[PDB]
Amino acid sequence: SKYSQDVLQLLYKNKPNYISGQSIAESLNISRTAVKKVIDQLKLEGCKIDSVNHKGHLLQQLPDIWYQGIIDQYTKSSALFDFSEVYDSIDSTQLAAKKSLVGNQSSFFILSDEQTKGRGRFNRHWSSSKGQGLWMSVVLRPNVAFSMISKFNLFIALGIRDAIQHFSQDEVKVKWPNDIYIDNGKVCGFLTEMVANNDGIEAIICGIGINLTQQLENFDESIRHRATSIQLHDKNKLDRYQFLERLLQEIEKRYNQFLTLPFSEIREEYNAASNIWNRTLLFTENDKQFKGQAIDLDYDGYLIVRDEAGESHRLISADIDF
Ligand SMILES: O=C1N[C@H]2[C@H](CS[C@H]2CCCCCc2cn(Cc3ccc(C(=O)O)cc3)nn2)N1
């Protein structure tokens, strides 16, 4: 009802202690009977709440659904994000973020259980099924020149990779510049956009799509051989909250590095984490396509490639297939 999020927030805020119905009733100023109705509704939606007479209620486990009340606890304690917008469905978190940043200097992120019109690089369709992935857009306000956009994309890749790697038994690798893999399966795609002028950056908008709990049968039949999810590499059930918590952790860690470190300081770390070496890569450049081999990521984030004809390229960004 009107108070599901408020009750949920109290149940979460009180872990691991039980909270009595009277206590919830007095803090939301609603009847004992209303409180039980809300608790019954939360359990209906998949919340695991233990209820004990004379003692109260204890949130044990949330379902595979984003709840604004819970996410409000994360932003409350965050030293980076002012707020967040949580939706069950939306056309795109990226479209929503680009609209919400206008006219302010807030830092925030937008979460949606499903996207109706998810878009990747080059306006590609991004599947954003309900209940199976993290579809998030992040808006930050770095006081840096606009050329720094490429460096942000490099620092954030290691952040996303680190959070995923924490939950995966198999190695998680970055595919420069915008994709993350677990073995041969893509588990994440991200992209960094900006609003800027000559005097600097007005906002960074980072759209992050992560496959959390798909089963192989849930991926398309065509892409199934090169698509994976975190759950497919975690012996334990994957918890959306637990993952989001570490993902926000790492984004903040890598965002402070971005502001304080040159790319030289993470470059070596970035190479050990990339899966683009010692292999034929296929490059797309508008109309042209060609094969080549990645030689190095230089000190400035540029990939150095020796193409099939022996010629060299130095690319700030590329469209790479395996
Ligand atoms: O609209 C929104 N965008 C963002 C936020 C939440 S998601 C987030 C999505 C951004 C994706 C950026 C990375 C990317 C990769 N590619 C090529 C590609 C993509 C999928 C497959 C596949 O078969 O899986 C294969 C190749 N394009 N773009 N909201």
Cα(286) to centroid(ligand 1), Å: 18
User: CA 163, CA 248: separation in Å to the nearest integer?
Assistant: 9
Q: Which of 123, 126, 220 for a ligand 1 pocket mutation test, highest count of atoms within 8 Å of Cβ? A: 126
CB 6 within 8 A of CB 30: no
Residue type, 9: Q
CATH architecture for segment(s) 64-275: 2-Layer Sandwich (3.30)
Residues 6+ apart with CB under 8 A from 317: 150, 177
CATH 3.30.930.10 domain range(s) in the chain: 64-275
- Which contacts of 67-73 are long-range, i.e. CB under 8 A and separated by 24 or more positions? 67/5, 67/8, 68/5, 69/4, 69/5, 69/6, 69/8, 69/9, 69/12, 70/8, 70/9, 70/12, 70/241, 71/111, 71/244, 72/5, 72/9, 73/9, 73/12, 73/13
Q: Compute the CA torsion angle 174, 159, 151, 176 (nearest 10 deg).
A: 10
Task: State how beta strands 108-112 and 133-140 pair.
Answer: antiparallel
Look at ligand 1, atom 5, and give the residue with the nearest C-alpha: 207
User: CA 322, CA 275: separation in Å to the nearest integer?
Assistant: 10
The class that CATH gives domain 1-63 is mainly alpha
Q: Which atom of ligand 1 is closest in space to residue 117's alpha carbon?
A: 1
- Select from 111, 110, 107 the least CA-distant residue to 81: 107
CATH 1.10.10.10 domain range(s) in the chain: 1-63
- Which contacts of 32-40 are long-range, i.e. CB under 8 A and separated by 24 or more positions? 34/1, 34/3, 35/7, 37/1, 38/1, 38/3, 38/4, 38/7, 39/7
- Select from 191, 228, 192 the least CA-distant residue to 211: 228
Measured from CB, residues less than 6 Å from any atom of ligand 1 are: 92-94, 115, 118-121, 124, 126, 135-137, 178-179, 186, 189-191, 207-209, 223, 227
- Select from 247, 258, 254, 304 the least CA-distant residue to 281: 304
How long a stretch of residues is the chain? 322
